[model samples]
Target: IVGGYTCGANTVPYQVSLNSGYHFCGGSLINSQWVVSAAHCYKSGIQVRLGEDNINVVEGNEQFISASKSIVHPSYNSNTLNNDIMLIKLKSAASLNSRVASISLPTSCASAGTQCLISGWGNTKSSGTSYPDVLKCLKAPILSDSSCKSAYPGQITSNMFCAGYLEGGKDSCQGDSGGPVVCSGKLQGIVSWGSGCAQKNKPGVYTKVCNYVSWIKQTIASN
Candidate 1:
């Protein structure tokens, strides 16, 4: 997360790291058995690491569980990055605690200008190799659909929205994809893509979570 501060221990209990041998993407625990992440982050051997504040340390609070299944949105388009969301079912249900809990899905859409919190362990630099050991967070406001469309032109879709300063300096980076964007304590967005890490006029784009609440609920209920 570029231009962000380190998150306090257990502050983001719903946050999880998607990993094979190392952290590759971020996700949010939606329930004991389900995690919400970007479809593009999918891989066969993913393990969900819960209650992880720092990736470099052996935190006793951590729970490492393998994924049972990864269900990507049927309409996901890799070329355009549309409907870039996915659900990961854990091999075992995570035990909820102070450092591990599920976050509620957004009840409604977050309007433009609404301040939101984005947390991740993605790169701290725009063009360098500097993934943080501890989680980092930044507060950014949701941009209007029209403005977002203008910024990305033909790239922004109904399933996606943009956030961050238009002048630059703060955003979710590469390894931050699939991470949570919380507004009013609800999961409102999922880090998906951006032109560059914290670039001017190139706000970070995210999957519109409110648009898929029903799909998420139905998938969880039936599976």
Candidate 2:
């Protein structure tokens, strides 16, 4: 979820609006003070959706929070895709109980076979498209070291993790970028890339939250 240095209630999912369009993606709530997501999603402006699940069904508990601050990774460069990650500081911290809740980051979630779950309101089928509303969830098993390396070739790094499919379909789509990769009931990664919406050979690429422990700690600590 994206957030400002000030509060948590404002930490919101990443939304993609062209010059001014709409919002997409689910971010992670690291601290009441910070939210993490993808850079592209931040460029437009964070659109907050809270209190409800049926995103299109806005009559329930949907709330919108404007972004107060957007901090893209310094190394991020669209051309090279240096850093695809980013942070958002919401205008205020969100306060919720059971119906609505926040997720925590993993301090030591690295494991070879650990199964992680990802959620978003993006495309349900590969190469298809993102849904206008309604959140979706998928399960991804952690790939082995060699498996991850072979899948993306040079793309796999210690900072990232791999989720595999191979057939062709069932993946995170365009709108899913910047969303949270939930695992073990905690946030373990941030959705970044995939072969396709739900491709057979391609699962999806995500930032290994465990690898960024230092950066996340310092970031939230300073803010």
Candidate 3:
């Protein structure tokens, strides 16, 4: 909500005040007060902490909400990680604080072959280890529709978006899952699956945020 999440300091941008300390990946602030985190982010308990620069327990604001109703995509296939999307309705509206604030949803999304930005506490080197306490983020031009398809023919689909460097050997890793893939100052995708933490010749997949706007709006409207 403040300064557009400031991608420069973007490390998940999660509020880690909730639970003991579990990272809340790809999240959006709908309706000025509600936070929509991935259902998969809810593990062990319905909890999420945000606003902290570090993912390892810090003094940030935490928001805990056991999903009132978990709604995962019907066609969600873990093997291919297709349709790997889910919705979690926070128990209550998140309180926007000095450091912790809500983010606006994108008005429009990119189609096939569009450039986008990827961010998170992901691995910088194509492989091995998550980022340090500081949230490390970088801009990566998304693969064109045809190129992404040809690159990941075994996985990339219309429902999924791909982002990575063309030079190869650089991409999001494990911790970056559920993070954000934004473009044109708008959020368009959520990190879903990847080729083993930035493997060369492989582009990480993201959840199509635009496609789920309607479903998300309809669901959030009621709350």
Candidate 4:
């Protein structure tokens, strides 16, 4: 969360913290029982927190749910980070309210030059090991896929996309993976991977959510 500021407690109602004993990554609630995250962040001991912002304390508005199942994308590639998105099924459904809601999915891909919003409890400084107590958010512009290719070369693929500043200093870092990249109130991307935090010209890469909508619907339907 380089160059990010503290987010409002209930600003992003669909926001969630993926905890394996402690907060390891972030995620977005897409429905009462489903969460969208990064495949790379999936593990055996994940838990989900809803209707809360500050991860440091247990708020009265929050609800904890065990992650019963984690379905990683069938075509996910760990090496190249292609198709890195994942869906999580909660053990129990979340109670929707003003502080707990779902984020809408994108009907189409985010276009180049579109400014989007990303939120998480990830590290504030790129090289820092500590994470912030409360959620943080920052605005980022979507770079053209062609422009992203120049930065990562062969790593850029159609299943993946990039967003951030070319001049550096603003980005999503460790612990932020599996978070949401909301564009125009819709979920457009999932924080997947990055070269190194907020390095110059190396924008944070994400799993393009639009490309996997059909798969998501299928998975939810079958499960």
Candidate 5:
């Protein structure tokens, strides 16, 4: 994330890294075997690394598991980027500890102006490639739907929302997609899309997680 700070070890216990050969995206562990991420990050044979602090270091507390199954939202529209959420079931359940835990889903929607925390190992610079080995976090304020729409006319949908400064300076960049956006200790959003990293009037857009609570529960229950 741009204009972010390095997170303490196990500070974001629910955070997980998605990898094919290397880290490509981030996700949030919602249960022992379930993880929530962006539908766009979906791929076969993904490695989910839990309890990660610094990817470059061994850390001795990491759990690497394969994805047994992935369920992307049925109505996911790639062109418009709607319903961009996905659920991944781990091949084996993760053992919970101080370094690895699941985050709670939101029971209520986060209102505009609510401050949220977003953590990931995405690029720190907007112009060139520079991924951080350590997890970085930024606190951003949620903007009203109307305000977000004005920023990207006819692009913002009900299933999506925006968060960050309108004047720019901080945002989730590339490689941060599928990460959690925690509001009041609840998973409220998923890093999804944006015009650019920390651009003026172009706040980072996220998949609204509150709207998919039933869908998430049903998918997990039936599986």
Candidate 6:
């Protein structure tokens, strides 16, 4: 989570690191073999590291998995960043352990004003400096569609949602894309993009996970 606090290593077991030789983005484990992240994170050399609290070293609980396939939203827009979510099919299933687990998907959209937790290895500021080797997390409030629309004008869509503070001081920055925004122990959003990392009245935008439930399920099933 951007613009927040540091959490215990085991606090978010479903968190995974997507690395392309270096830590590039964050992801969430939805099942034994599927990882959900932002479509913009997809690229060559993209592999996953589970049960990793620190990105600089290999630990006992760490499990490195290769990507067998990646499926990005067909309608994803890079400019508008609508439908920015994606899924990765692991070459092998992750072995569930104390430090490795899956998060539950929500059945419906999270209500506005709900406080949710986000975590990632992204930059701490919009200046693009200082990224933590250890995971960092923050609490952000879900904004109503109308409220979010006020911030982004016509850019905000039903496929997207907003979270964080209007006063700024906290937000997801570079390298945070594709992380998880969880509420009530359920996966609610996928970190996508923002207007410059925690700017006042510019909360980070996310891919509303609940909107793609049918698509996610069908994709996983057919694959």
Q: What TM-score does each of the candidates earn? A: 0.98, 0.82, 0.78, 0.97, 0.99, 0.97
Candidate 1 regions with alpha-carbon error over 4 angstroms: none
| Model 2 TM | 0.82
lDDT of 1 by residue, 1-223 (tens): 9999998977999999999999999999999999999999988999999998889898789999999999999999999999999999999999998789999998899999999999999999987878889999999999989889989988988899999999998899989999999999999999999998999999999999999999999999988
Ranking by lDDT: 5, 1, 4, 6, 2, 3
For 1-223, candidate 3 gives per-residue lDDT tens digits of 1001235433344322223244545455444345444445545454544565555654445444444455566676766766666665555665666556554567786765566666565455543443455465656666677777877776677777677765556666666666667677676777787667655667777787887778777766775
Look at candidate 3 and tell me the lDDT of residue 47: 58
Residue 114 in model 5: shift from native, Å? Answer: 0.7
For 80-176, candidate 4 gives per-residue lDDT tens digits of 8888989999999999998899998888988999989999998888775767888899899999988899999988888888999988999999889
The residue-by-residue lDDT of candidate 5 on 1-223, one tens digit each, is 9999998888999999998989999999999999999999988889999999898888899999999999999999999999999999999999999889999999999999999999999999988889889999999999999989999998989999999999988999998999999999999999999988999999999999999999999999998
- Tens digits of lDDT, candidate 2, 171-215: 567776877776677777788875545555565777777766677
lDDT score, candidate 2, position 130: 33
Over the stretch 1-223, how does candidate 6's per-residue lDDT look in tens digits?
A: 4567887786899999998889999999999999999999989767899998888976677999999999999898888888899999999999997789999989988999999999999898766588899899998899888879999988988898999999888888888899999999999999998788888889888999999989999999999
User: Which one wins by TM-score: 2 or 6?
Assistant: 6
TM-score of 1: 0.98
Best by lDDT: 5
Candidate 2 wrong stretches, greater than 4 Å: 1-21, 80-82, 130-132
The residue pairs in collision within model 4 are none
